[PDB]
Coordinates of C-alpha atoms in Angstrom, one line a residue:
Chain A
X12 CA -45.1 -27.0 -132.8
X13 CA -43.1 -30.1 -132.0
X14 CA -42.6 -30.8 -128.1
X15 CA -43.8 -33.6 -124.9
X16 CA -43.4 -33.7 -121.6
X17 CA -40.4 -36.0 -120.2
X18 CA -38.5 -37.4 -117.5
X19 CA -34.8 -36.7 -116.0
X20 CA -35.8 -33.5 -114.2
X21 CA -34.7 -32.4 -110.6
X22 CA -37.7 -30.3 -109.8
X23 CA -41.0 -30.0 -111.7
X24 CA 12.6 -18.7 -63.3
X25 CA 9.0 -19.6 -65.2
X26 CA 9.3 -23.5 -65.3
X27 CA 5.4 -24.3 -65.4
X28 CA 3.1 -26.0 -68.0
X29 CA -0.8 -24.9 -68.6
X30 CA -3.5 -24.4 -71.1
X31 CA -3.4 -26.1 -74.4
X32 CA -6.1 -26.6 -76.2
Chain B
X8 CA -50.9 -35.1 -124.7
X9 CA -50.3 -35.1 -128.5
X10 CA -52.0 -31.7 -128.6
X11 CA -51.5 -27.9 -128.0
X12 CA -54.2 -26.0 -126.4
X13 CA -57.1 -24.6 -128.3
X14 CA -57.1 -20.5 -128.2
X15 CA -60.3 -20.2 -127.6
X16 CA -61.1 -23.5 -125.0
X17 CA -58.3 -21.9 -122.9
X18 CA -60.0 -18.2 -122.9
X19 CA -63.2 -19.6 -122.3
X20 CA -62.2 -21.7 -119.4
X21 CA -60.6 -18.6 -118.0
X22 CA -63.7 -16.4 -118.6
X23 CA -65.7 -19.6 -116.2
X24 CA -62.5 -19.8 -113.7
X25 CA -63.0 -16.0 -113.4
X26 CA -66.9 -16.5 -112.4
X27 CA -67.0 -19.4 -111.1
X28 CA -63.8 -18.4 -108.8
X29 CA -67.0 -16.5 -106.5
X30 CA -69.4 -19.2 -105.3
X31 CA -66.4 -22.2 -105.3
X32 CA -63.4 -21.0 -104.5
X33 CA -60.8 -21.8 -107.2
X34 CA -56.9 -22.1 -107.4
X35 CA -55.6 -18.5 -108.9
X36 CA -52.9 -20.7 -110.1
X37 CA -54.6 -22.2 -113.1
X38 CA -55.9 -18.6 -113.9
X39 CA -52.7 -17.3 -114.1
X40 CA -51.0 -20.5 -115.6
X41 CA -53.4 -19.6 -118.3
X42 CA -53.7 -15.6 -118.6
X43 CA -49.8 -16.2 -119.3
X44 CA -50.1 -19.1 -122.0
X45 CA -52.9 -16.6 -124.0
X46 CA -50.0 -13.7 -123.9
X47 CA -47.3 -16.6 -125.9
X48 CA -50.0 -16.6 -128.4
X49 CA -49.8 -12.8 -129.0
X50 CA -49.4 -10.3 -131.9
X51 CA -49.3 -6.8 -131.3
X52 CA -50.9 -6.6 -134.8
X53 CA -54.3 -9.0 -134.9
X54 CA -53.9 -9.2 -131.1
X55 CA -54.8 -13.0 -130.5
X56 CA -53.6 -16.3 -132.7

């Protein structure tokens, strides 16, 4: 029988360069 | 709220809920909220508490 309602919830060749990234 | 529900205020408000629910249209939340509280209060044997 004992209960309340309360608080604290949270819902109620190749030498070339190219192309790097 | 230093109270639990009466069995039989709830049941009755749910009987009214039920009717009333025709003319006024009424939230089936608080019906069901309720059908489910009056099945907590349950015994198999002596059906209702």
């Amino acid at each position: 029988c004992p209960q309340l309602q309360q608080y604290e919830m949270h819902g109620p060749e190749t030498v070339r360069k190219y192309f790097p990234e | 709220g230093r109270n639990q529900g009466n069995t039989w205020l709830t049941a009755f408000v749910l009987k009214t809920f039920a009717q009333a629910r025709a003319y006024i249209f009424i939230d089936e939340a608080h019906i069901t909220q309720a059908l489910i509280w009056l099945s907590q209060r349950q015994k198999d044997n002596g059906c209702f508490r």
